[PDB]
Amino acid sequence: ASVYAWNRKRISNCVADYSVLYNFAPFFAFKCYGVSPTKLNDLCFTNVYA
Amino acid sequence: GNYNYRYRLFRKSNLKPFERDISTEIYQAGNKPCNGVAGVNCYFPLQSYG
């Protein structure tokens, strides 16, 4: 979608594995605020929007 | 921005009381990392306050 038409979604009720990312691409821009990327897979969340 | 004061943001585990370390190696990236370069998770350990 376009910049002014981002595709909101909700993703809950799932066993979430944040390590499928690293097999995608060189990941030019990847920086996390409030939580370290290394210790993400363990921590838990209420509702995750993308 | 006074870029003179820094602080370790990434490390491996917790430290014992009154345990000081200065090492500024490049943090790992899960696999054999990008020593002295950028990439998936190539994060310098120190960060300036500014």
Side-chain angles (χ1 to χ4, degrees), chain A, chain B residues 1-11 13-15 17-27 29-40 42-50:
Chain A
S2 51
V3 299
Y4 63 89
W6 38 283
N7 187 0
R8 190 74 147 202
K9 193 185 175 141
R10 187 192 142 172
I11 180 154
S12 278
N13 194 38
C14 59
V15 166
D17 180 274
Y18 288 97
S19 61
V20 289
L21 292 63
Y22 307 146
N23 272 7
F24 202 108
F27 275 167
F28 154 72
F30 177 80
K31 62 179 282 181
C32 295
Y33 315 90
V35 290
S36 88
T38 179
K39 80 179 181 304
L40 206 41
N41 186 340
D42 50 50
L43 173 149
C44 208
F45 317 86
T46 91
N47 215 22
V48 177
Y49 292 170
Chain B
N2 205 340
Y3 308 123
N4 232 337
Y5 305 96
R6 305 222 279 292
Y7 81 101
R8 192 171 311 268
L9 170 58
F10 280 125
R11 195 196 181 268
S13 69
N14 283 341
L15 55 164
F18 301 141
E19 168 162 335
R20 166 182 55 187
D21 43 352
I22 309 197
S23 42
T24 58
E25 75 157 1
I26 294 284
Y27 185 77
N31 57 276
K32 180 70 184 77
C34 54
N35 323 112
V37 176
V40 49
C42 233
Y43 295 137
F44 198 60
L46 270 54
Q47 270 86 0
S48 157
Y49 277 155

